[PDB]
Design a protein around this ligand. Sequence first.
Ligand SMILES: *[C@@H]1O[C@H](CO)[C@@H](O[C@@H]2O[C@H](CO)[C@@H](O)[C@H](O)[C@H]2NC(C)=O)[C@H](O)[C@H]1NC(C)=O
Ligand SMILES: *[C@@H]1O[C@H](CO)[C@@H](O[C@@H]2O[C@H](CO)[C@@H](O)[C@H](O)[C@H]2NC(C)=O)[C@H](O)[C@H]1NC(C)=O
Ligand SMILES: *[C@@H]1O[C@H](CO)[C@@H](O[C@@H]2O[C@H](CO)[C@@H](O)[C@H](O)[C@H]2NC(C)=O)[C@H](O)[C@H]1NC(C)=O
Ligand code: NAG
Ligand code: NAG
Ligand code: NAG
Ligand code: NAG
Lengths: 293, 294, 340, 343
Amino acid sequence: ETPPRFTRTPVDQTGVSGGVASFICQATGDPRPKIVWNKKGKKVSNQRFEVIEFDDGSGSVLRIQPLRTPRDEAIYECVASNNVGEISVSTRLTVLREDQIPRGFPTIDMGPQLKVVERTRTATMLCAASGNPDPEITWFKDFLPVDTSNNNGRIKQLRSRGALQIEQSEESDQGKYECVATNSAGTRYSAPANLYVRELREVRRVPPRFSIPPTNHEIMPGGSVNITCVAVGSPMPYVKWMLGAEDLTPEDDMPIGRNVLELNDVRQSANYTCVAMSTLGVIEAIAQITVKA
Amino acid sequence: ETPPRFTRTPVDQTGVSGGVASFICQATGDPRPKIVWNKKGKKVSNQRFEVIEFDDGSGSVLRIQPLRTPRDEAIYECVASNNVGEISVSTRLTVLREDQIPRGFPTIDMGPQLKVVERTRTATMLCAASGNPDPEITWFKDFLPVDTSNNNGRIKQLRSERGALQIEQSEESDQGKYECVATNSAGTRYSAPANLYVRELREVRRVPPRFSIPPTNHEIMPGGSVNITCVAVGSPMPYVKWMLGAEDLTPEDDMPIGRNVLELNDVRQSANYTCVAMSTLGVIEAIAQITVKA
Amino acid sequence: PCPGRCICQNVAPTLTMLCAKTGLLFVPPAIDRRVVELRLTDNFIAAVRRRDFANMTSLVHLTLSRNTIGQVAAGAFADLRALRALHLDSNRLAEVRGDQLRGLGNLRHLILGNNQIRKVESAAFDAFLSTVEDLDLSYNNLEALPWEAVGQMVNLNTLTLDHNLIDHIAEGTFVQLHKLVRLDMTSNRLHKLPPDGLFLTPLTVSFGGNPLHCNCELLWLRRLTREDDLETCATPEHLTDRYFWSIPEEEFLCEPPLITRQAGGRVVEGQASLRCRAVGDPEPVVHWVAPDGRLLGNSSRTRVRGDGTLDTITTLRDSGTFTCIASNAAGEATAPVEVC
Amino acid sequence: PCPGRCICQNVAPTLTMLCAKTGLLFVPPAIDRRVVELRLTDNFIAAVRRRDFANMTSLVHLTLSRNTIGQVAAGAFADLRALRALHLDSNRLAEVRGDQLRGLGNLRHLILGNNQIRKVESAAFDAFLSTVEDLDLSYNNLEALPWEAVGQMVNLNTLTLDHNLIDHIAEGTFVQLHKLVRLDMTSNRLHKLPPDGLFLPLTVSFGGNPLHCNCELLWLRRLTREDDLETCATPEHLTDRYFWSIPEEEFLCEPPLITRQAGGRALVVEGQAVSLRCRAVGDPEPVVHWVAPDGRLLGNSSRTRVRGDGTLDVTITTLRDSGTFTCIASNAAGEATAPVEVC
Ligand SMILES: *[C@@H]1O[C@H](CO)[C@@H](O[C@@H]2O[C@H](CO)[C@@H](O)[C@H](O)[C@H]2NC(C)=O)[C@H](O)[C@H]1NC(C)=O
Ligand SMILES: *[C@@H]1O[C@H](CO)[C@@H](O[C@@H]2O[C@H](CO)[C@@H](O)[C@H](O)[C@H]2NC(C)=O)[C@H](O)[C@H]1NC(C)=O
Ligand SMILES: *[C@@H]1O[C@H](CO)[C@@H](O[C@@H]2O[C@H](CO)[C@@H](O)[C@H](O)[C@H]2NC(C)=O)[C@H](O)[C@H]1NC(C)=O
Ligand SMILES: *[C@@H]1O[C@H](CO)[C@@H](O)[C@H](O)[C@H]1NC(C)=O
Ligand SMILES: *[C@@H]1O[C@H](CO)[C@@H](O)[C@H](O)[C@H]1NC(C)=O
Ligand SMILES: *[C@@H]1O[C@H](CO)[C@@H](O)[C@H](O)[C@H]1NC(C)=O
Ligand SMILES: *[C@@H]1O[C@H](CO)[C@@H](O)[C@H](O)[C@H]1NC(C)=O
């Protein structure tokens, strides 16, 4: 047998009222350690207090929501124990109110939004947090902390915008995600956002290709001609027109696969560029328009 | 017995389409002549054509409304006849349309409006007609011509010292539908109809405005606030207002009946305030002395 | 080609299509253009596009009752020359324009009840003035009405305006409407009704639920013998909340006009203002007169206000006695002023 | 002393007054202030004055159904502290202000159905947020709604919005409404529904809406509900199609593609004003966000503006912090990034 040892211990938190506060606690031993949460000596028992145990059985997470001050502002402890041991760790919870929120306290500029990804594909959940000093960002899936400590797994967190990138999606990834911003000043939770995993739909991906490229047209001085540009591919290209560097079809909703340009009062020869765009490539084609006497 | 003789014969009219055209024809004899109207030889028979006979039986009036051109543009004749005679007179009706209306053609600027008068009282119905030259004005009560040729009856028409119709000493027989008619050398135009109603006499006493409670003199310290009460009575009840010499202190939206309490604020100088009571029987005044004593 | 949950029988010649309570969001596309009867009640159609009823020259009945139709495109009912009846009741229409009712040559039944119609375009009924027998505009937000158009509707027999904000009804109307048997003016803002051909094959004229002003102008109506339709007075204070037919004729009083603010006989000889305000029951009408002609206001060189104020550029030699005339149902008031 | 054509029972405890179809133009004056039940249906009342229900501290049920009430004066119900139910259905109300519903401490039933209410004032329900159990705003002209107020109505069990123009439902709402059993969102302008506590008893009706059938409604399609004749309006492939008849696989979202970039490079050496453009396209329409070189997201604040199109406008540059201004087009199906490098 082996006495319990802490693998992760909770730290001193400082969240806002009405918000969230989570305490993570994990331990290992032989046999498996059971983790109990206490407030002021007695085991926690409240409607706003929920304990979520890890899938490994390696521990649990004490979640407090919504934060009520100062009824929750106290000392909470984690007691890990098995047949051959009993250890504990205690931490402090501070709950501010909006009146007492200091300038520099973490603020969610942009939270995660609803996203749907197919299986075995890559999904990304964004989160932008501000504050003084710069807050570090962590993630929570279904009240449990997302393990991104492994820099080389399917689930990673991008350095610098600490967004969560989920590669090779599986059904287990489907759940409720929420972003957490924490600095030396305190901790703020973002709104929850659902991730859905649908089955893999095998669609063919082909870069944009001009099925009907623009032809060169000769015209009388002022002067009117219609030029046809058609592109194909999967996904279907958005076709636009340009005059060298600047766009010629501004403020329009870029048509799909086909764009016919109309010229009027042509008094000078010019070259007009047709551009087709997709997420798989960008192709171009110019048409020579001349003004003959 | 005595064969018919014409007392009044119709004249040539020139009205507008959609309007009205009335032909007056009267005769006398022994026995009383019956009057028949004809168009192109045949007796008139149409939905828009109505014949209104006088109450005395002295004749009738052919009324055409609304005027449709040129279905009506023809020659109409009046045939008075009894057992011992048969005479006739004929006139022409011309019906224009708005396209053909000349500048100077009679136009009703203001027509008669709804009126209600008590018995034995005086009622007046207005009418303003324009045109070149100046059109003569006549009146029609219940499709019949009002006789105001007699300048010395209860019913008169004002011209000198606006050809309005003035009805004195109203009786129930005066209750009906009136309409003004403007006629010159150019043509004839009718005004919109207006009803006159005769209700029973309400015996009320007529008393000019009298101050039951005139404004009293009040002294006040500089700034300064005082309420002044002015009460007037009479039948009809006076409209009480306030003035400071020449300018009005009371708006004609809030203008009270019989009682007006004036409120002063920030009185920093002595002044005289005029209270005025108004009715259709008189206009009386009263001043209140407002002084600023320490 | 029938849509789900719809009952369409396409057996010639009478093609019928019914799509009641099928949760439609739009007017079903590809409807056979030889359709005679088409009923789309109790759905959720938001707008009517002109393409919806493009070439339906065989359509005789169109029913769009109880939707959320808030917009009807121009010429939406064009080419509906065979349409007899049209139902747009219980929707969100805000106005009735001429380009919307264009081409309804055979229209005999028009129901626009329970909408939010704020204004009806003058002569928007031109396509079917001579054919209409039934017109419903009940439960809307109409304060005004193209009476001049209504007056031409000869074959009209039932006109309903059950619940609007109509302030006044034109006097000359209804003179040619000989087939009219029902007129509903309940719940409006009518202060009075004009002495029209109201009294008369039978006729039922309802005018309850109005803020009636009970003076001499309604005396003619009180003298009539009609059944109590719960008519009630709102003004004046002496007669407020009192039932109309319960008040004796003698208590309907008018007060003669009294000119309160005259000018006083009181300029620059180079630029034009005169004041005239009368008071009475009903509120007097102010008219001005020229020294030898009748003055007209609201014009090029002369302007007149609702208050009675005469307002541009004075002539160097048009000075005389300018008299002010305050007309009223109980009498006239005159206060002349002489300016130079 | 009962007003004409009215039926009044003055036997304690329930003093009742009924005036149905009596052609009323106003609310009857000098009505006994000890009244418990008051019913004024089917008349022609134009407006509600403060004097109408002045001192009725015993009134518990007030019914003003089927009139032409177009205006309710401020504090008209200020002294009706004993009022449980209020009926203003089938009238001409155009808005619901806070000063109108002031002093309704015991209001538990509020019915405003079949009116023309264009706007409900935020926190106009403050007098009865903790007590209200029933709120009806069906058949009106609401395009928006103070959801933040609705979220506080704990005892609310029936909320009906049967026929309005409501475009969207706030996501955070309905979290504390544990007693809510019926929510009607039929016939509105809802393009989508938020993945809220819609699933649970509970009856959530959302038929008659111009549903946009992409991935954002996939979660709802996965539910097991009866066909309430819900129908899609967009995209074209699914127009006029019944919602629950469509297989889950056909609810598609399209990843964002940034069509109109700055072009990857920009340069201004002085305080002169600069402007950047970013326009994305996809299904649903992507949301554009900009970032500072310091990795700070830029919002609608001083010296910086962002438009619905996505264009970033900066007026007075410091230039002390020159770096890569990146454009991020977020979308339910993915993200797009088009960076620009300024100095
Ligand atoms: C449009 O593009 C074509 C080539 O893509 C240009 O034509 C060439 O111009 C160069 C010098 O500018 C010559 O060396 C080539 O001989 C030309 N080739 C052909 C086929 O003409 C053309 O000048 C451009 N026109 C404009 C207005 O920019
Ligand atoms: C011409 O006539 C109209 C009325 O028919 C005048 O319009 C009125 O203007 C006053 C205020 O100036 C308003 O109080 C009234 O409500 C208006 N009348 C209506 C029916 O709305 C108009 O002012 C006149 N023109 C001039 C120059 O006086
Ligand atoms: C930032 O402010 C601008 C206005 O200054 C917002 O632009 C409007 O936004 C709405 C929709 O959000 C559009 O319908 C309007 O047409 C826009 N008007 C103008 C003048 O731009 C903009 O939405 C705000 N953007 C953010 C991210 O807050
Ligand atoms: C170009 O396309 C437009 C489409 O409306 C058409 O009107 C025009 O006639 C065309 N011009 C030429 C030269 O083809
Ligand atoms: C004058 O009248 C007003 C009316 O409310 C009143 O408030 C005020 O007290 C009065 N002042 C005096 C001196 O009576
Ligand atoms: C008020 O009227 C009297 C005359 O009755 C006069 O003597 C006095 O000067 C007037 N007071 C003022 C302030 O004009
Ligand atoms: C309201 O009620 C009580 C008795 O019912 C009465 O004493 C009080 O004066 C009333 N309030 C007012 C302003 O009249």
